Amino acid sequence: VPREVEHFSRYSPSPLSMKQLLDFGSENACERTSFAFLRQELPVRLANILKEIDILPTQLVNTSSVQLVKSWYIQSLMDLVEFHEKSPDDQKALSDFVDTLIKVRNRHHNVVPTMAQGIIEYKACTVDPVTNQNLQYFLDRFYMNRISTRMLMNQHILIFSDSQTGNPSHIGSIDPNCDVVAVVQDAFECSRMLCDQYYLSSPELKLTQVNGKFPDQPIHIVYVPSHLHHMLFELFKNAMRATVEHQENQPSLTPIEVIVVLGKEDLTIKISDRGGGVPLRIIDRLFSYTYSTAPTPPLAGFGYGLPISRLYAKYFQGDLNLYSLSGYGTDAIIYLKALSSESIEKLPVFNKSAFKHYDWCI
Amino acid sequence: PREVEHFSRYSPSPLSMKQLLDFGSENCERTSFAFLRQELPVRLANILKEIDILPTQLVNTSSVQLVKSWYIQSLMDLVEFHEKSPDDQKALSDFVDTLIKVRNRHHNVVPTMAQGIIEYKDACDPVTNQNLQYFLDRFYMNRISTRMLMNQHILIFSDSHIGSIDPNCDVVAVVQDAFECSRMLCDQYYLSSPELKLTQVNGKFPDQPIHIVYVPSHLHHMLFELFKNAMRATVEHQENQPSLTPIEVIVVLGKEDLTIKISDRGGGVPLRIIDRLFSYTYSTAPTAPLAGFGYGLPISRLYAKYFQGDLNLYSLSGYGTDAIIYLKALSSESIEKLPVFNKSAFKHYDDWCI
Ligand SMILES: Nc1ncnc2c1ncn2[C@@H]1O[C@H](COP(=O)(O)OP(=O)(O)O)[C@@H](O)[C@H]1O
Numbered sequence: 043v044p045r046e047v048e049h050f051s052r053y054s055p056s057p058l059s060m061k062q063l064l065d066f067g068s069e070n071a072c073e074r075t076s077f078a079f080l081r082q083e084l085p086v087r088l089a090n091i092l093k094e095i096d097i098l099p100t101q102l103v104n105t106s107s108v109q110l111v112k113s114w115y116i117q118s119l120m121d122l123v124e125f126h127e128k129s130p131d132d133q134k135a136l137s138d139f140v141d142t143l144i145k146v147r148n149r150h151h152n153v154v155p156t157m158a159q160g161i162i163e164y165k166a167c168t169v170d171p172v173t174n175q176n177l178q179y180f181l182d183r184f185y186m187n188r189i190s191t192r193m194l195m196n197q198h199i200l201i202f203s204d205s206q207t208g209n210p211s212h213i214g215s216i217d218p219n220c221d222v223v224a225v226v227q228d229a230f231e232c233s234r235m236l237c238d239q240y241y242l243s244s245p246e247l248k249l250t251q252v253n254g255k256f257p258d259q260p261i262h263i264v265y266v267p268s269h270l271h272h273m274l275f276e277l278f279k280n281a282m283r284a285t286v287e288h289q290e291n292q293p294s295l296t297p298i299e300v301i302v303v304l305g306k307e308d309l310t311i312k313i314s315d316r317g318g319g320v321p322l323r324i325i326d327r328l329f330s331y332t333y334s335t336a337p338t339p340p341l342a343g344f345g346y347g348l349p350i351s352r353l354y355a356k357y358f359q360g361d362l363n364l365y366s367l368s369g370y371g372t373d374a375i376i377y378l379k380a381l382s383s384e385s386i387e388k389l390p391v392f393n394k395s396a397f398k399h400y401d402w403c404i
Numbered sequence: 405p406r407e408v409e410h411f412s413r414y415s416p417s418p419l420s421m422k423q424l425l426d427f428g429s430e431n432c433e434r435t436s437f438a439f440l441r442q443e444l445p446v447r448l449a450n451i452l453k454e455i456d457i458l459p460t461q462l463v464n465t466s467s468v469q470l471v472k473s474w475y476i477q478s479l480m481d482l483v484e485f486h487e488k489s490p491d492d493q494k495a496l497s498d499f500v501d502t503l504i505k506v507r508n509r510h511h512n513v514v515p516t517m518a519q520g521i522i523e524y525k526d527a528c529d530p531v532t533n534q535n536l537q538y539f540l541d542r543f544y545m546n547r548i549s550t551r552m553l554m555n556q557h558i559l560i561f562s563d564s565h566i567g568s569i570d571p572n573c574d575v576v577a578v579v580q581d582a583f584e585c586s587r588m589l590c591d592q593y594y595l596s597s598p599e600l601k602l603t604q605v606n607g608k609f610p611d612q613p614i615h616i617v618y619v620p621s622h623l624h625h626m627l628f629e630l631f632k633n634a635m636r637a638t639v640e641h642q643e644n645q646p647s648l649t650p651i652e653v654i655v656v657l658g659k660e661d662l663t664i665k666i667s668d669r670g671g672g673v674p675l676r677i678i679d680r681l682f683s684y685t686y687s688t689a690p691t692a693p694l695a696g697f698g699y700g701l702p703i704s705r706l707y708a709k710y711f712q713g714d715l716n717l718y719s720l721s722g723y724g725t726d727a728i729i730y731l732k733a734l735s736s737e738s739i740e741k742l743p744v745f746n747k748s749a750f751k752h753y754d755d756w757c758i
Pocket residue numbers: 276280281284315317318319320328329333334335336341342343344345346347348349372374
């Protein structure tokens with residue numbers, strides 16, 4: 043373990059709210075602040091997850107895939123710590139920092155499929171997240187950590203780079219006025235298109251919306267629309283496969299019903315299908331990485347749709363749950379915080395209590 | 405007391421609803437006597453050892469001291485029968501009388517325990533509070549379990565159901581029944597009440613009615629408590645409306661599960677607050693009212709879980725709430741879920757950023 047890794051792993055991550063992120067990109071003078079923060083914060087986050095990695099089973103860690111991820115994380119941490127001797131007022135340092143985040147971003151581009159392959163390899167020993175709770179626990183933390191460093195670095199790139207400026211209507215990747223229903227309809231369409239290619243039909247969308255906060259007004263919150271789209275797209279692909287296969291011998295498809303509700307503290311989206319449901323017994327299994335009732339290949343089969351969409355929801359203190367009526371259909375529900383100031387990053391920390399994690403006759 | 409130490413050494417023996425049918429059919433009295441004279445003391449002694457791990461100031465409240473003396477007396481009454489032959493007809497008859505007496509003695513256990521929790525909280529922090537929730541879940545599940553056993557023996561052996569089990573429980577009729585009980589209370593208190601809109605799907609046997617083996621009084625209690633909740637939420641959220649949205653209920657029978665979902669437009673609950681809804685005593689009402697005591701949710705969930713079902717709430721804050729009951733569809737799979745006092749329960753009395 044390089045000394046810089048050991049050092050930075052002793053700090054805990056510092057979580058930001060979406061309110062704070064919006065304020066960073068509020069103006070140009072914040073670049074030196076974002077620089078001074080991220081040059082310390084990114085090494086802390088990388089070092090915390092690196093020390094976790096070393097806790098994994100030897101046969102996992104020594105996969106070429108996990109040895110690659112670790113070598114990338116370590117190089118990225120060094121690249122960043124190189125900036126510690128620079129003045130935040132040094133305009134050349136700030137320019138070089140942006141270029142460095144672009145290089146780290148590119149270097150980390152295939153981290154998720156790379157880890158997912160380490161898992162596959164390791165799954166040799168037969169061991170699995172569906173049957174191994176430690177592996178599940180690690181993958182939630184590794185992937186939430188990744189979501190968090192990507193979000194922070196992208197914010198700085200998309201606000202301060204010359205060449206990569208993101209949507210002019212967003213602050214970094216955040217839409218301070220996210221048209222939630224619009225993102226629902228777009229994700230539904232994406233899913234429809236994939237579904238039609240596997241089955242030559244897909245259900246229709248029946249959408250309802252309720253603005254409890256101000257009745258009859260359009261529903262908007264501060265949100266990252268790509269995260270929202272990914273959760274919706276994964277739940278739509280799931281509802282559509284379940285619907286089509288359950289109903290295959292009927293004259294037509296029951297639509298998927300979606301309701302979007304804005305309340306004082308929460309934005310909630312419920313997606314209801316008549317896809318035959320799931321026995322209560324296997325509901326928890328459904329959120330394990332790799333768990334799929336489909337053959338492994340894509341519409342389905344890798345088993346990442348649920349646990350990853352749930353990490354997106356939980357990342358800013360939201361949640362994702364599924365409640366099924368076996369024999370009939372399923373409700374999938376996303377909860378997001380409606381106030382940017384309560385939308386706070388949910389981060390893993392490598393400490394005694396994490397290390398430890400690694401009466402009813404029921 | 406000595407009997408308590410001894411019997412606390414055994415772990416409870418859970419029964420499935422299939423075994424209770426099988427052993428409640430013929431008129432089994434000698435066998436049920438032999439079993440219950442051992443099993444009842446084991447379950448009493450188990451929860452008695454657990455009461456003793458509680459804060460000293462809770463254990464000493466007059467209410468918990470009452471519960472403890474009742475449980476100990478019942479264990480003693482029951483242990484006396486270990487000197488009798490299961491072929492002694494006086495004994496068999498005296499055992500029925502003894503169970504009736506234990507049931508009467510325990511009749512006020514829940515309010516008395518609930519009162520103990522008050523004397524304690526008025527007399528004296530959230531970690532303990534979490535421990536109190538874990539304890540009350542186990543204490544009340546243990547009572548549900550002993551009351552279930554004692555009552556089967558009483559109803560079958562004393563002087564269509566098999567005891568309290570209906571082998572053909574008409575789920576939809578029990579729904580309608582509990583709805584009506586709730587509606588009457590709602591009308592009396594609020595002057596109006598929502599209608600029931602009920603749908604059913606038999607996935608297991610399309611077009612056929614939905615029956616499973618179940619304890620209708622348990623199912624009734626759960627539904628009643630959830631309807632009282634849905635009705636109050638609806639009426640209070642729509643207080644400036646000329647009418648009331650119905651409560652929508654769907655009953656579904658699938659391969660493994662019977663599911664019942666109750667949907668209201670009672671304005672729902674912030675997600676922040678969902679878990680605390682299942683806290684004993686948590687209520688947004690004051691204090692016939694429909695609400696105020698705060699036991700509806702946690703108790704209904706113990707009934708659901710006792711035979712390995714479950715009960716969850718999911719809400720769309722600003723709009724309404726779904727409450728959902730799951731029951732096992734197979735009598736062989738409806739097996740009692742029982743607390744046991746072992747080192748692992750004793751052990752039961754940060755990794756992600758705050
Ligand atoms: N709406 C749904 N209805 C029925 N089953 C579902 C639903 N959503 C997910 N599942 C079950 O959960 C599994 C896991 O979903 P997911 O994690 O998206 O992986 P994948 O779709 O790749 O199988 C699915 O294979 C399916 O068995």
